[PDB]
Structures are given as C-alpha cells and as structure tokens.
Amino acid sequence: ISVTTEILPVSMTKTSVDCTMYICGDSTECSNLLLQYGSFCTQLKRAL
Amino acid sequence: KKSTNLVKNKCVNFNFNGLKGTGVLTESNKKFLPFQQFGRDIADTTDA
C-alpha cells in the first residue's frame, strides 16, 4: 500500500495599479499634461 | 530667497535647496557622513 504526493497551484495574487502616481507622482503639471493622452487607465483597471 | 519655520508630521510642500516636493517630514535615525547631503532609494528618489 503506497502513498504519493501531488501539488497543484490554484490561485494567484491580486494587484492594483495607479496611473498618476506611477507616471507623474507629486507634480501637478505632469498630471495636467497627462490628461491629454487617452484612457489607457480604464483598460488597465478593467484587465486587473 | 526667504526662509520659514520647520513643520513636522503634516503633509506639506517643501523646497529644500531647490529640491521641490510634497510630503510629510519625520525625525530620522539614519547616520550620514560629513560629505553627504541626502540619500536615495532604489528608484533614485530622495528619502532623507
């Protein structure tokens, strides 16, 4: 009578990202400049 | 230029010798050397 071990992954860690903090940070001028590019943030948020 | 009193433990704007930023200032236990002025983190942003 033998006993064997098998290991299988199931889940994965969940992450969230912020656009303005990563790209611009603590500068308002960069935010006002970045407001005129598009809506990539919506796509990133939806995927995550 | 002018000068102003130092406030701590409140989110404020600071201009240290031309270095502009927004954040909260705290007493530090770090030890510097006579030829050093500030430190940096992994992403080359000032922390001390």
Q: Note whether B21 contacts A: Cβ–Cβ < 8 A.
A: yes
Contacts of A30 (CB under 8 A, 6+ apart): A23, A24
What sign for the dihedral angle of Cα B44, B22, B20, A19?
Answer: positive
Q: Note whether A26 contacts B: Cβ–Cβ < 8 A.
A: yes
Chain B residues with CB inside 8 Å of A26's CB? 21-23
- A46 min Cα distance to partner chain B (Å): 27
What sign for the dihedral angle of Cα A24, B41, A44, A42?
Answer: negative
Give the DSSP per-residue string, chain A. Answer: ------------------HHHHHT-S-HHHHHHHTTT--HHHHHHHH-
In units of Å, what resolution does this entry have?
Answer: 2.9
Q: Calculate the alpha carbon distances from B44 to A16, A29, B13, B30, B38 in Å.
A: 23, 21, 20, 17, 11
Q: Note whether B36 contacts A: Cβ–Cβ < 8 A.
A: no
Experimental approach was cryo-EM
Provide the 3-class DSSP secondary structure of residue B21. strand
Selection from B24, B32, B33 nearest residue B6 by Cα = B24
